[model samples]
Target chain A: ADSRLPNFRALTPAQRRDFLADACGLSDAERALLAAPGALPLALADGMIENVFGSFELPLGVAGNFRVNGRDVLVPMAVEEPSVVAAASYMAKLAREDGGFQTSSTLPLMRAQVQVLGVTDPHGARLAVLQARAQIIERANSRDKVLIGLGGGCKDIEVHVFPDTPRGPMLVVHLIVDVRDAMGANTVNTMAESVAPLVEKITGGSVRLRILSNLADLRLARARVRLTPQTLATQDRSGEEIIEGVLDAYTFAAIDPYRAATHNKGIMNGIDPVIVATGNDWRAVEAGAHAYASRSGSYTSLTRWEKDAGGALVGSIELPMPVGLVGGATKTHPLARLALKIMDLQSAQQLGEIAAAVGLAQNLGALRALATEG
Target chain B: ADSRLPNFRALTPAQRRDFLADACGLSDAERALLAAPGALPLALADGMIENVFGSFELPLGVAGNFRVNGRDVLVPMAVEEPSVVAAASYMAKLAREDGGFQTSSTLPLMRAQVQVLGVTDPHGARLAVLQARAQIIERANSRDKVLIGLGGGCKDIEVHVFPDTPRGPMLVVHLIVDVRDAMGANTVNTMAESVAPLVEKITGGSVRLRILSNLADLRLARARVRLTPQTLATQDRSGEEIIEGVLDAYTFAAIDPYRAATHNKGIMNGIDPVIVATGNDWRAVEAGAHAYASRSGSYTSLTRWEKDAGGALVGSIELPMPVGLVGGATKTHPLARLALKIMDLQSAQQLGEIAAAVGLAQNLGALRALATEG
Candidate 1:
């Protein structure tokens, strides 16, 4: 499928939807869902959240020319901000000259933290928890038989001991779980609760605050794009000059937390829309990305830009993308289901990879605009 | 206007809208807008974004029982996640026992960065920029007459010098501007661009990447809530026990980055929905928040919980809340306008303070659930 849409930007909303229907091979029913006054009924909206009043509508747009991992994919973005879709589409167009965005992702592994407090010997209790790691993992997997059968369950355990805290000694046991196609917050939280008894017995302490960590560092997605000088050349600025300016911007973001905040915000502008359109937890994804950006003790850019030895501009982004294709809003919202079908996503990993690719493209668009205009 | 709604949660969507109409003194036309299939027409959505396909709807719910700064304010949240509205509303109900939430905010000050690269003497150039601060301020303020007339414009200049970077020496001049009621991104970006030539001439360097920083630390909002032990007693547990458990949860977040990520994500779960409902940029708010959380060298909890000497649970939250009421989607989206009316908001600061209050309530709710359930 060709993602390149001729004059897609000039088309009207209905025209774009019709074009998307043809391109994605959508049924008339699916097309009607997109064209409906509100894809989600008020009654359904009332059930999704509490104290329901009405529904809020955000502008939904599609970015053209996104080819990820050698497969053409049309990107549907639901966002309020202007220029996000246009910027992503234009950058994707630029990326297509060099085989588009190459994407990769780690397994959908989530970490659930089960914190145990009031332990006298934190370090000793940590070792004890690790000693009983197999028992804990087995207990965690016992509750989720279907997940275990699907080859996705508690895989490992890690213990982190904080010997000195304001409250007292603490031992935090981390349950590493592979949550296949789901975002895994509930699954991991349930697993953490299931293993709390075993961890408490092993550490001889009371368990408190058993939940999934939003810093999903282990579940990561990476996207890389290369733009040549010829392809990047503007009317007034050379591609080399553009690359140099973008590098300077990158360096500024690398060294300054202030710049990095906006720099990463631009990346989320591209990613969160896809997340929202697909009914995933965008706040979780935002938390993971920003927290991962500050992993080096200072907040920095999630993306890196450089000039290759061949003088081509290379851009890559890596961030924790714990999105899901099932459960919660993903299953409940009709438009969300259609959004998944629009992309032909087979797994959560694919969604994360494609979202990262869009993020990389969006970053390039921001850099190019700053380089050329400012 | 009382925010507390009796049996609000059990009411149907239409009934809740009707209740809100009377509570907020909404006009007939305004009430009709809430009942419409989609508040934002397709034409407007098409114009708001690029390659417009259709509008996406998020469940919009009103969280009742919120009193900010001794005034009742109902929160309109547009989110897909369950339990957020209920949690915030329930927490607000508990908070009412102690005068609800006390909120405050700094002036709407925002920072714009003008990066000057290739400076040979970065330190000396920093001094030069600071010395010529008056001229730069004047130049920045000259572009926005209306903003200046509103007693809000460039007020100060700060220079940050990075002498040894991968690229070279760099001097970033920051323009401190009071954006009044707007989000200040475009205002600050324009000011940064307006002063770029002056900065270049003063520093004898080339200007690159002139933009607004999303790390809106100067534009801070704070909310504080107190709950007596008697007000917090659950069915099965004493309030003291609940407070201890919550404190343990807080300590876990304070000491562990992994725990803090989820803790702050819960806070954003409350804040982002309000931001989206008001047609503000949630990504910018998310960036400022998580970036500020990492300001202490490690990512930690944004909200603080402690037991007072009187055995009362006190919670407070402070974060950069660069939201606006006057520009972009805030003006374009009809429901966003209705949301502001629902709250009777007079300034952006009020919105920020209320948002922070909800966030604090949300954090407490998460801690309580974690403390009691698991």
Candidate 2:
């Protein structure tokens, strides 16, 4: 399972597809699916959204040379922008000189917020809600027996009291659910709705908005990459000089929101294509990334780049990766399923890690180019 | 033209396309283009990105009942998520009762950053850069004569001196360019590169990173919507009650980053689809929006909701929208060109306003449902 595809860009698209088919062990019929006009039929497209007119197509390309967590992976990216796939693949090629990208993740936890309003004693009501946390969790789990059977359901509850809003005292209840392989929006939303009555009863207030939060701070995916000066050396500049240049770019992004925005946008350029290809919500991932970047009160870069004591360049990125492999477009769109199969992904966590690893590679590519060329 | 399409969801996709052809005065050839498997051929898809295998399709749907600034406009949305088009259309239907949506925008100004490092006297270098602003602007504008002839080019310059940083003293020069109908990234990036020599000579320092800033705060688009109690009334809930509930939801978003992430995700749910339909960069728009959301030092809601003195609900949204019609996928993709024609948009500013209006309507839709149903 070598991700390194030499002279891949020079080949024709059909040749590339044939190469991918053989590399990933795809059947002839599956390869034919890649050559079709589209994997999604017009009738199926009509069912996905409202007032269907036709379908919109974007270029679907695969980035080569991505090795995550000691395993080679093929990344199918659906994007209109040029250079994204090339950049990610190039950076991943350089990263292989190290041990490739090491990846990790938190539990697949999602938060559903139940906003309760008009509570006079907000703190007291918060305590009361906490007092009935077990019952509330039980009520939430009661809605989906299958999820419980799969060892995924509501696990904990958190209460926040906002007593000084314009509409009197307010309390918000957070239902932390381990959604397993799903994106967990519908599951969490259902759990929030099921627990609303109990929350309202405990707080003695009316329940308002109950939905899944896209912030997704608790569900994070992380990837780290290390590069030596020798591996990073170009024809003109030394690897140490390039590392220093990338550090300067990193500092600029750290201090300035304007630079940070574009820096993070480059990261999403690598992450969102996989998201769109796999039928996950890219907007959710975007929201979580930007919002988490601003968690320290000012917007900053999502990736950290620093020089190690040994003069090697070390980079890492951790962001909320709320993506799913089951249901939604991933299940409905044939190519999306094929994309998952191409990567040989076993869980949503693996997908998130790969996305993050690609994101880190992308950030490295941007920084390397900016630092050396600019 | 009337944008109100009664029972449009009931019609088949082909019937809807035929209806759209009649409404937008599409030729038979254009109608055929819509009925085709895809407007973008595989060859073009291969050229759009690297390692191209095929194209990916998303549902292309038209949201109806949108009237912006006294003119009826149909919005073409490409998204995989359900309920977005329906929610936006339903909200627009209610907004039309109060003159639809009033939209406005700033000049299409984009920022390009030229980071200069290794400067000993940073503040002095910043002042020197500012003194050479005219020369820098001219140098930046020299790269694009056609753009200058079209009344869009580099206009101004601003210098920020970071006297102290991890990378020692640094100064960032921002090239403010009015990009007219273009997204302006390539234009601005080229301008930054063009002026780098002059900046290096003036500051006596090496230029590091030359790129366009996606923060785009100078290129802002705004939309305002007004809804009376009667227009927002539900079968079980009074208009005033729904308004109150929406206000509560707004406050929650204003105070909590978790709520704000979902709230703004809903707004982008309305925005990004239109961006993709027109072949604009949704990732850039998403970056600008969520980054702007954190400009106040904390991540919060991008839309404002309030009660008018007359007891009507008033809502407004402001965010950066950098979209272009002249280049990139907008020009290469036939469906993207058709999407622009469907709305009869003359300028990028108009498209930004319409996008902002839809975003406002989307925020209202989310609030209304959460407040009343939850």
Candidate 3:
């Protein structure tokens, strides 16, 4: 308790800032931004959430040496948890020999729902909307010409008819948009709002709810990792054997819902904190993710585990990463901004890649601990 | 940005204490406890984590107006999310006229894992462990006289044969125990650890990992809520119709994982904050919960929605509520203690009951918003 830890003594604030900047490879402005509150410009936060008052802050930290599928990234983590950064970094450090993480993502596409009520003929209204899909798309793209200028707007329209609903027959229309480089919620909602008037006019029905759905099944991100047994072998058991056991465990979850529930928990262990750090709505992500997990009609593991031909354990996670690096709190919150800087991430895909890699790595940790600790 | 908040008018420390104590129903000792820094106590903070110079705190708040099934209760909520407490209280307030919430629990049973490796005859070890199940149970149970005294301990054992693996043939034995009133992690882990010596002896194999499984599928708690069209109907529509719509939605999820994930996410909207308020592990709870959702080999909604014989909308949630009232941060943290006190929680089941009811109300809130806000 008596100063057992090595003391840093004291350094000028500038020295501390410079040291952190060097450790994180921050630009001078980013380094200066770390020193106090209100580091992020205000406009960004306003567009991310509903209303804007001022801003809130949280600590940001970096997890280093993350290599997924043989890729290296200095990952940004926005969480108050003490060990997440260290644990992620340490695990990634060990994984570096395999090259960091390999990652890919679907286009920044999202869906918004337009609920049409008071429609006497639901199926007829559905057809009306379907027939006028081109008009609806035109209407949606008419507003926000800047977005259109940037080559993004309504790409398609999907109509879902709910006949015999409790409230009566109803129709729900989905407006799909490619929200490139953005989280797409606001963009999609604007399109839905724009299309609602046309929907009301064409269907001769009252529109009830028109907003973005957090159930983002189509916006997916995938990451994979392969760790050789030689890297995992230890005195208690060879790394080869542990890798096999982990793969078997992964398969159990992939094959069974009962096991999948536990299996995906391992993945969330890594992803949730990142979402939280970014100031994105975790509940939304969780909704989309778990919903996506069972899209196969069974709640299966979001991640897959298998033994490679060389006896190495291969891990991968495919889930809806409905996150944006430049939206909402990702730019406003103190720690969120810090995290963005730490990763030096250029695209939402990079963030998603890091999230996926972290998810698989976390799975490795859980499975290894569960298998060996026993 | 000026002093728009009417200046920093505040109570003196003592005045603040009195105001809070009167409002929250704290005793003199507790009030005294709040004013001091050491009041919260200290943690070595040395776990499988990083950064340990100090501890951290998050404000704790509680929700009121809950009657589960037919009883009254106060709910403890620990979250920064605005509107959750207000929404839960509003819904519960409405539900109270008919009855509060209807709740039940499967049992407070838990599972422990004992890994056996270095077995030349993995097939033989499985049989040996099975033959010695009685001894294993006895040894595990004897260690926790108090748990047995409280009517909990090992009741069953299952042997899982993992053969033809990289580690060679292995046998994983599960010891299922009823945890009585506790959340039952360390206690169960100890019991699992105690069996290591006996398992080694019986199977003629080395014991590797002895731990408690966080899957916690067996130790499940459930709660339900029902509202007629009158209850669901605002002045505009009859509650009967809303109930019917909720049932349709539930039916969709019960049969489809696509709907279940969102449904369960709605449930977590009710539970996670309480878990956080109690200083329990939100990640752990989230992990177990999402995993439980996919238990049928696909991730699905944790809550089932349906129309009862009365044509009223009925909702139920059954999941692994592995929440403890006594361990981790629940007892150690200040706001946690305050949160539990505010809710006047008597037992873990009481807390679980409140959580489940919150789940029901939150689902309705979500649906109502979706149904009307369009």
DockQ metric, candidate 1: 0.92
CAPRI tier of model 2:
high
Candidate scoring better on DockQ of 1 and 2: 1
Lowest-sum lDDT 10-residue window in model 3 chain A: A1-10
Model 3 lDDT tens row, B1-374: 01011111233334434554565677877766554433332232223124221222222333456666555555555333445555676677676656767888777777777767677887777888888889888988987887788777999898887676544666778899987767776787788888888888888887765666667788777877767777677876677756655554554445444445566676787788677666566666666677677667665567767778877766677877777787765655565666677566777766766676787787767666555543
Interface RMSD for every prediction, one decimal? 0.7, 0.8, 7.6
DockQ of each: 0.92, 0.90, 0.19
Candidate 1 segments whose C-alpha is farther than 4 A from its true place: none
lDDT of each: 0.93, 0.93, 0.65
Error of 3 at A73 (Å): 4.3
- lDDT tens per residue, model 2, A1-374: 88888798799888888889999999888898988785788899888889998999999899999999899999999999998999999999999999799999999999999998878998988888888889999999997999999899999999998889777777899999999999999999999999988888878898888999999999999999999999999899999999998999999999999999999999999999999999999899999999999999899999999989999999999999999999888999888999999999999999999999999999999999988774
Model 2 reaches what TM-score against the true structure?
0.99
Q: Tell me which of candidates 1 and 3 scores higher on DockQ.
A: 1
TM-score of chain A of 3: 0.84
Expressed as tens digits, the lDDT of each residue in B190-231 for candidate 2 is 999999999999999999899999999999999999999999
Off by over 4 Å in 2: none
Tens-digit per-residue lDDT, B1-374, candidate 1: 79998998678999999999999999999999998787899898888889888989999999989999899999999999999999999999999999999999999999998988879999988888888889999999997899999989999999999899999998899999999999999999999989988888898899888999999999999999999889999889999999988898998899899999999999999999999999999999999999999999999999999989999999999999999999999999999999999999999999999999999999999999989994
TM-score of chain A of 1: 0.99
* DockQ, candidate 3, vs. native dimer: 0.19
Tell me which residue pairs clash in candidate 2: none
The per-residue C-alpha lDDT of model 1 at residue A67 equals 95
